[PDB]
Design an enzyme around this catalytic site. Structure first.
Site, short mmCIF file in Angstrom:
data_model
loop_
_atom_site.label_atom_id
_atom_site.label_comp_id
_atom_site.label_asym_id
_atom_site.label_seq_id
_atom_site.Cartn_x
_atom_site.Cartn_y
_atom_site.Cartn_z
N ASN B 190 0.81 -1.23 0.00
CA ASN B 190 0.00 0.00 0.00
C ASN B 190 0.85 1.28 0.00
O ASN B 190 0.30 2.36 0.23
CB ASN B 190 -0.96 0.01 1.20
CG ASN B 190 -1.87 -1.20 1.29
OD1 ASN B 190 -1.92 -1.91 2.30
ND2 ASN B 190 -2.61 -1.47 0.22
N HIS B 192 3.12 2.25 2.10
CA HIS B 192 3.37 2.73 3.44
C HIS B 192 4.62 2.03 3.99
O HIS B 192 4.87 0.87 3.65
CB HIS B 192 2.18 2.41 4.35
CG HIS B 192 1.03 3.34 4.17
ND1 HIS B 192 0.76 4.33 5.09
CD2 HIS B 192 0.12 3.43 3.17
CE1 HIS B 192 -0.30 4.97 4.64
NE2 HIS B 192 -0.73 4.46 3.49
N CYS B 227 6.09 7.37 9.44
CA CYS B 227 7.13 8.03 8.64
C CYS B 227 6.60 7.92 7.21
O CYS B 227 6.20 6.84 6.77
CB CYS B 227 8.49 7.34 8.77
SG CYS B 227 9.72 7.78 7.48
#
Ligand SMILES: Oc1ccc2[nH]ccc2c1
Ligand SMILES: Oc1ccc2[nH]ccc2c1
Ligand SMILES: Oc1ccc2[nH]ccc2c1
Ligand SMILES: Oc1ccc2[nH]ccc2c1
Ligand SMILES: Oc1ccc2[nH]ccc2c1
Ligand SMILES: Oc1ccc2[nH]ccc2c1
EC number: 3.1.2.14
Lengths: 268, 269
Positions: B190, B192, B227
Site C-alpha cells: 500500500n 506505506h 514516517c
C-alpha cells in the site's frame, strides 16, 4: 528443494509472502533477486559445500579465495503475486579460466510456464587483498563434477542482452537519489552489503511516475567495487530511450564507481 | 500453514533463509518480526478476510476504518539458525472497546520447545483522517467469532514487560544515527513504510560493540506517528542500565516530531 535426477541442477519452490510484494501486489525484483541467492546457496549446500555460506572448494579455502559477482542479468515476463508458488531451477557452468556462470529459470509452479530467467558472472578473488585471479587447473577440477559439461544457457542467443557492454553515465544525470546508506538489515552473515541492496539503490533514482505506469522487464548490473557499511552512495539515472535507462552508483564523496547498469521497462 | 482444530488460532512453519541471518548465523529480529506479520496475514486470510491485505470487517471497509499497530513487544530466548525450521502460532483477542491484541508463540519445530513470544496492541483508525476511535458494537460482533473467548496470553505474568509505560528520551542522547530514509524495499503493498523498518531504525543507534558481544533478548516499541516515504528519521539511544538496557527514540530529522519510542534488553553472549 532438491537436486534433479542427474545431480547437475537444483530446483526449489517458494510461496510469495505478503511483505515481499510491492504496489501491484506482485513480488518486487529485490524479492526475486533474494530468491535467486537462496536457491544458489541451497544448491551449493546440497552438493557438499560446508555450512559457512561460501561455495568455496577445499583448495580455494587454503588459498583464501572466494567467488564474487561481476555481473547480474535478470529478465521477468510475469511477477508472481502474493500467495503464488514460483519454482526456480539453477545450475553452474565453467567459462574457461575466466570464472563461472550461474543461471536460473523461473516458472509458475501451477502452469509450468517460464515466467523469468537470470544469469550471473562470478570471478575468483583473494578475500584479503581483493585481487582478482584467473581460475587455476586444480580448482576447476574440484568443481567441474558439479557442472553440466554440455553448454546449458538461460540466455542462449548469440551476443544477447546479458552480454552487452555498459557505458559510463555522463554528468549531469537526468535523475538522482543521494546519501543512500546501508543499515544492519542490508548486510549478510559476513557483515558485507548484500548484492541485492545494490539493485535497490540503482532503482531508487527511477522516478515514481515510471514505477507507477511501467513494469521492470530487464535489469543488467555490473559490480565494480563494494560499498562498505560506513560508505554513502549516490544513485544516478538517465533515460536512454518501452523505456530504457542507463544507471550509475558512485560513492557520495570522491565519486568512485561501485556499480553501473541498464534497465528496460514496459508500459503496464 | 493452517488453522488449528478449533479454528481459533493459526500455525505456520518457516525454514530460515541464508539472507535472513546476521553475523551469528541466526535470524535477525527483523526477519522474526517479518515472519510474525506473514503468519498474522495468513491467519486473517484463512478466516475469510479479503485478498486486499487488510484484516478489515465488512462494516470497517464501509466506514473506511483500518487496524493500526500501537505497540509491539517481542522476547526471543533462542534465534533460529539458517536452515532451521521455526513454527509460529498466532491468535487474536478483543480488549473491550480499546481495540485488539494479536499474540504469537515461536517454537523450534524439531524439539517443540518455546524459543520466543510476541504480543501487539492494535487500534481502529479512519484510513483518511488518521483519527483513532473506540471499537463499536457492530464491528466487534463481526470479529468475535474469530477469537478465543477465554483469555489466552503469550505474556501472562503479573508485572510483564509488554505492558510497561515507556518514557521520553531526554537530549543529549548517548548514541545516534541520523538521516535514515526508507527506500522502495521498505514499503508495503500500500506504499506505506513496513512496521518492521521502524525496528531496524531503532536498532541502528545501538553501538556495533554491543551487537558484537550481546544478543537482543527483549524489544518493546510504541508507534506514535507514521514516517512518510519522503520523511527523514533520526534514531536516538541512551543506556539505562550482565544485562544491558537501552531507552530509544525515533524522531523526524527536521522538526523533531516523535515517530516511535522504545526499550531494548540485551544479554551477554
Ligand atoms: O547468488 C548467490 C549467492 C550466494 C551463493 N552461494 C552459492 C551460490 C550462490 C549464489
Ligand atoms: O564453486 C562452485 C562451482 C560450481 C558449482 N556448481 C554447483 C555448485 C558450485 C560451486
Ligand atoms: O568479466 C567476465 C567475463 C566473462 C565471465 N565468465 C565468468 C566470469 C566472467 C567475468
Ligand atoms: O502483523 C500483522 C501484519 C499484517 C496483518 N494482517 C492481518 C493480521 C496481521 C498482522
Ligand atoms: O479484525 C480481526 C480481529 C480478530 C481476528 N482474529 C483473526 C483474524 C482477526 C481479525
Ligand atoms: O493503548 C492501548 C492499550 C490497550 C490496548 N488494547 C488493545 C489496543 C490497545 C491500546
Amino acid at each position: 528443494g532438491s537436486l534433479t535426477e542427474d545431480g547437475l541442477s537444483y530446483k526449489e519452490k517458494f510461496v510469495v509472502r505478503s511483505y515481499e510484494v510491492g504496489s501491484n501486489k506482485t513480488a518486487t525484483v529485490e524479492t526475486i533477486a533474494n530468491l535467486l541467492q537462496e536457491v544458489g546457496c541451497n544448491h551449493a549446500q546440497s552438493v557438499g559445500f560446508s555450512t559457512d555460506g561460501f561455495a568455496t572448494t577445499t583448495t580455494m579455502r587454503k588459498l583464501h579465495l572466494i567467488w564474487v559477482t561481476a555481473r547480474m542479468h535478470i529478465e521477468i515476463y510475469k511477477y508472481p503475486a502474493w500467495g503464488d508458488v514460483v519454482e526456480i531451477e539453477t545450475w553452474c557452468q565453467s567459462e574457461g579460466r575466466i570464472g563461472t556462470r550461474r543461471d536460473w529459470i523461473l516458472k509458475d509452479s501451477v502452469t509450468g510456464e517460464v515466467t523469468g530467467r537470470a544469469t550471473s558472472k562470478w570471478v575468483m578473488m583473494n578475500q584479503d587483498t581483493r585481487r582478482l585471479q584467473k581460475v587455476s587447473d586444480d580448482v576447476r577440477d574440484e568443481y567441474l563434477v558439479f557442472c553440466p559439461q554440455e553448454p546449458r544457457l538461460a540466455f542462449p542467443e548469440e551476443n544477447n542482452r546479458s552480454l552487452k557492454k555498459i557505458p559510463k553515465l555522463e554528468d549531469p544525470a537526468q535523475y538522482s537519489m543521494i546519501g543512500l546508506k546501508p543499515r544492519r538489515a542490508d548486510l549478510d552473515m559476513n557483515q558485507h552489503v548484500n548484492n541485492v541492496t545494490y539493485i535497490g539503490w540503482v532503482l531508487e533514482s527511477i522516478p515514481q511516475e515510471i514505477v507507477d505506469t511501467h513494469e521492470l522487464q530487464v535489469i543488467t548490473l555490473d559490480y565494480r567495487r563494494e560499498c562498505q557499511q560506513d560508505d554513502v552512495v549516490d544513485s544516478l539515472t538517465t533515460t536512454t530511450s518501452d523505456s530504457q535507462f542507463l544507471h550509475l552508483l558512485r560513492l557520495s564523496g570522491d565519486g568512485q564507481e561501485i556499480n553501473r547498469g541498464t534497465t528496460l521497462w514496459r508500459k503496464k
